[PDB]
Amino acid sequence: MRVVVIGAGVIGLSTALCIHERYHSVLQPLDIKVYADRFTPLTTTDVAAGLWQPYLSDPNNPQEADWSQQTFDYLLSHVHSPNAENLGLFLISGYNLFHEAIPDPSWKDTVLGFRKLTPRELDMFPDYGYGWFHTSLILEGKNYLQWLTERLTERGVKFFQRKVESFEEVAREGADVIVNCTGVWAGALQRDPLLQPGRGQIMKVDAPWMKHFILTHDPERGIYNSPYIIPGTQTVTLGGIFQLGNWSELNNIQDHNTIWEGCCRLEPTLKNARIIGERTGFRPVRPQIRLEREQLRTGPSNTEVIHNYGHGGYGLTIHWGCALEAAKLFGRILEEKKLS
Amino acid sequence: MRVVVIGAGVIGLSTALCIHERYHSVLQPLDIKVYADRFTPLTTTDVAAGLWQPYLSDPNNPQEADWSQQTFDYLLSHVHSPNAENLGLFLISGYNLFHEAIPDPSWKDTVLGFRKLTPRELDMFPDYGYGWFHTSLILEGKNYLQWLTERLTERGVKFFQRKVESFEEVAREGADVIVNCTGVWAGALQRDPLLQPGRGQIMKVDAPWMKHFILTHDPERGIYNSPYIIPGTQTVTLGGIFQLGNWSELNNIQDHNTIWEGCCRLEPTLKNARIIGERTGFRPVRPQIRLEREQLRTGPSNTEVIHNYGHGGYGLTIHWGCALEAAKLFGRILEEKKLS
Numbered sequence: 001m002r003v004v005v006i007g008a009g010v011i012g013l014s015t016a017l018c019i020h021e022r023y024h025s026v027l028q029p030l031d032i033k034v035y036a037d038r039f040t041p042l043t044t045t046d047v048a049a050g051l052w053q054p055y056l057s058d059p060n061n062p063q064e065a066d067w068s069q070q071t072f073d074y075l076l077s078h079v080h081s082p083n084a085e086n087l088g089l090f091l092i093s094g095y096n097l098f099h100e101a102i103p104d105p106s107w108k109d110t111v112l113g114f115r116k117l118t119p120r121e122l123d124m125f126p127d128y129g130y131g132w133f134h135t136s137l138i139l140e141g142k143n144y145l146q147w148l149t150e151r152l153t154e155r156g157v158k159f160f161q162r163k164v165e166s167f168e169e170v171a172r173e174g175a176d177v178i179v180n181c182t183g184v185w186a187g188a189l190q191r192d193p194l195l196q197p198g199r200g201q202i203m204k205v206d207a208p209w210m211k212h213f214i215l216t217h218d219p220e221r222g223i224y225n226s227p228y229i230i231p232g233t234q235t236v237t238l239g240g241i242f243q244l245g246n247w248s249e250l251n252n253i254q255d256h257n258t259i260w261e262g263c264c265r266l267e268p269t270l271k272n273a274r275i276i277g278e279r280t281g282f283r284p285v286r287p288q289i290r291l292e293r294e295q296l297r298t299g300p301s302n303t304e305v306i307h308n309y310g311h312g313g314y315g316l317t318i319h320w321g322c323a324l325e326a327a328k329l330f331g332r333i334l335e336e337k338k339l340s
Numbered sequence: 341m342r343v344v345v346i347g348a349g350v351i352g353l354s355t356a357l358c359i360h361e362r363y364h365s366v367l368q369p370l371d372i373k374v375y376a377d378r379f380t381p382l383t384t385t386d387v388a389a390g391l392w393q394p395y396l397s398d399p400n401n402p403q404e405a406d407w408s409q410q411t412f413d414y415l416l417s418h419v420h421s422p423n424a425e426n427l428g429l430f431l432i433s434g435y436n437l438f439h440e441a442i443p444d445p446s447w448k449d450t451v452l453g454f455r456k457l458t459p460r461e462l463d464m465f466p467d468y469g470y471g472w473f474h475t476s477l478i479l480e481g482k483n484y485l486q487w488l489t490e491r492l493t494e495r496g497v498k499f500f501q502r503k504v505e506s507f508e509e510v511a512r513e514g515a516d517v518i519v520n521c522t523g524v525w526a527g528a529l530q531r532d533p534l535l536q537p538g539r540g541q542i543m544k545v546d547a548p549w550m551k552h553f554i555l556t557h558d559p560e561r562g563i564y565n566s567p568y569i570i571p572g573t574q575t576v577t578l579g580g581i582f583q584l585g586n587w588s589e590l591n592n593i594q595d596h597n598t599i600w601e602g603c604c605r606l607e608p609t610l611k612n613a614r615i616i617g618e619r620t621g622f623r624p625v626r627p628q629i630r631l632e633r634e635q636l637r638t639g640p641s642n643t644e645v646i647h648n649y650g651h652g653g654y655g656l657t658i659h660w661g662c663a664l665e666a667a668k669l670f671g672r673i674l675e676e677k678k679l680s
């Protein structure tokens with residue numbers, strides 16, 4: 001039973017591990033391999049702040065609600081031990097800024113201490129008329145990626161730097177199953193005009209004094225496009241830039257400028273931070289995550305493909321859910337192959 | 341009108357300044373001079389984390405209450421100028437924890453958004469069964485100290501490094517009001533037996549992931565005498581050591597071990613912290629603070645003396661209200677002296 005997982009990103013690695021942890025007992029020669037064009041120092045996943053927080057109303061696909069949920073419980077049930085900071089996982093409270101009023105978020109009750117910004121609080125914010133306050137999780141992109149990797153590697157799972165041209169180049173080369181974890185780049189193996197990139201740019205700056213994330217919103221510019229401050233482990237991230245169809249993986253002046261103005265306006269102590277650096281990446285956007293099976297009809301018999309992409313700008317808030325899902329689906333492939 | 345401030349910790353410096361800003365437009369020769377034996381790194385002030393938060397229950401003297409409020413009110417009022425970082429003044433949220441339930445603290449309304457621990461929050465704490473959570477401020481002693489200094493100096497209050505032997509050395513050598521800010525050490529210049537060492541000791545450590553203070557409380561072991569963990573700007577303050585009468589300004593191997601255990605039991609991820617260093621100081625303990633006048637019946641006239649010391653484990657928490665009050669006394673002098 002040989003398995004190729006494409007994408008060394010959060011999804012790929014989470015689903016890799018999640019399938020392996022689940023099925024090495026109940027399956028003789030489980031071979032797993034990740035094939036990836038870009039590896040952990042250089043993926044989109046590597047760019048995310050890594051705070052957990054689903055959009056503010058509820059999904060096209062009300063199950064995501066459940067996937068985010070459990071991502072949450074899982075991380076939190078791991079929040080004290082020697083592992084936590086390896087992983088780069090730790091707890092963090094902070095703010096949600098809105099002009100007008102707005103209904104509670106579905107999720108309200110997964111997080112701890114969710115509540116509404118009382119008025120002493122909102123004075124602090126002259127540009128804003130309302131918010132929430134709550135304690136959430138960061139799972140920092142880089143670390144999660146580096147640990148997952150050392151767990152996969154202790155599990156005998158084998159990495160390979162490549163471009164996969166198409167499912168069948170890989171069926172062809174030998175594989176009962178293809179877990180498709182390929183992100184914004186999904187479409188280039190099997191067209192899907194539903195997927196598009198949410199371009200983003202953030203600044204990592206020096207501000208250790210920052211102890212709260214602060215998230216503004218402004219539907220006049222939409223989601224993921226109003227300035228945010230996510231204190232990280234080592235450094236604080238500064239963004240607010242979302243833009244459909246932008247395929248420029250390259251830092252932009254105008255964006256910088258927008259990031260830094262809004263962020264300084266939001267918290268002026270930042271005017272003294274030292275910029276460490278800056279980065280772009282591509283949210284894989286889509287009305288809903290794609291995660292289903294597809295028997296790829298292909299020579300003497302059909303290979304099996306699990307699709308697990310389109311997580312957009314909430315990839316880490318969810319990944320674990322997803323991964324436990326593509327694992328279930330995976331099991332099924334098994335019972336059918338009369339192997340379960 | 342020449343004025344001597346003894347002591348250069350937080351009490352002195354704030355009182356010095358507060359007095360300068362209040363009264364230098366209304367005294368022509370108003371000469372200010374600060375006398376002190378230990379200065380800016382070498383004082384009890386430097387050793388405090390700088391967390392704002394008054395004892396659980398309400399004070400032997402219920403103005404101390406207002407002077408926390410005031411102090412707090414103000415600092416918070418400056419939260420966000422583009423100094424606060426210089427100040428080392430910044431917001432922090434965090435946990436209070438207790439084995440039993442407890443009446444709300446008196447100040448709950450001063451702190452940002454205080455609220456009791458929920459069951460979920462709670463489970464990160466086997467060994468504690470009840471508690472609070474609220475957002476507050478830290479005023480990091482080392483910085484606030486450096487700051488008041490650079491303020492004081494432009495204002496050209498002058499500083500000399502020197503152990504004063506008695507009030508009258510100073511009155512003698514020509515001064516007019518004397519403001520006594522001398523900390524735990526007030527005894528060497530006027531017997532006062534209500535005042536004694538809260539010798540505390542702390543560890544400063546590299547845990548850049550912690551974004552919350554956590555304070556462990558217990559009647560059994562008594563105030564500041566339990567595990568607490570306070571994110572500072574560069575570093576994390578690690579302590580829960582209080583001991584009456586101990587006069588040893590030297591770091592203690594048991595205490596060393598006591599801090600590290602209490603903190604690790606509480607936040608096992610702290611196993612990775614790098615110890616960076618460690619330190620001891622003397623809480624100026626006393627039933628109530630001495631902020632009052634006295635006419636020292638020196639030589640020909642009297643010289644007046646403001647007493648401002650014995651502030652406990654909570655100087656930073658209160659120092660401002662104290663300084664105002666201390667200047668309101670200063671100003672009560674001038675009129676009865678007919679210089680207003």
Ligand SMILES: Cc1cc2nc3c(=O)[nH]c(=O)nc-3n(C[C@H](O)[C@H](O)[C@H](O)COP(=O)(O)OP(=O)(O)OC[C@H]3O[C@@H](n4cnc5c(N)ncnc54)[C@H](O)[C@@H]3O)c2cc1C
Nearest residue numbers: 008009011037038045050051164183200313314315316317
């Ligand atoms: C600025 C910004 C901030 C964000 N902040 C957050 C946040 O706080 N929280 C949160 O939950 N999410 C956040 N996100 C969202 C999150 O980053 C994405 O959901 C997530 O990282 C995507 O996971 P992935 O594995 O799907 O994609 P990626 O991380 O890009 O995985 C893609 C992999 O696909 C490989 N690949 C593609 N095609 C092929 C091929 N044919 N052959 C081989 N390899 C291939 C690439 O080389 C790479 O290995 C943010 C996104 C951005 C842009």
Ligand SMILES: Cc1cc2nc3c(=O)[nH]c(=O)nc-3n(C[C@H](O)[C@H](O)[C@H](O)COP(=O)(O)OP(=O)(O)OC[C@H]3O[C@@H](n4cnc5c(N)ncnc54)[C@H](O)[C@@H]3O)c2cc1C
Nearest residue numbers: 347348349376377378385388390391504523540655656657
């Ligand atoms: C471990 C620890 C943690 C703490 N954490 C906090 C906290 O989180 N928050 C909070 O609000 N408080 C905290 N405190 C309380 C705070 O530390 C003190 O109350 C404060 O430093 C006392 O003010 P002070 O200037 O009187 O003391 P000091 O700063 O020691 O004032 C003493 C000054 O007077 C001088 N002096 C004394 N006698 C003479 C003399 N004859 N001649 C010349 N100079 C003299 C010394 O050189 C020094 O300048 C903490 C204390 C400790 C020990």
Ligand SMILES: O=c1cc(CCc2ccccc2)[nH]nc1O
Nearest residue numbers: 051053215224228239283313314
């Ligand atoms: O830029 C991003 C920032 C984040 C986390 C913070 C956030 C969460 C909800 C709404 C707005 C911002 N997630 N995904 C992204 O793309």
Ligand SMILES: O=c1cc(CCc2ccccc2)[nH]nc1O
Nearest residue numbers: 391393540555564568623653654
């Ligand atoms: O050691 C100390 C620590 C602090 C601040 C944090 C704190 C506040 C309330 C209860 C326990 C700790 N203040 N004063 C001290 O002496």
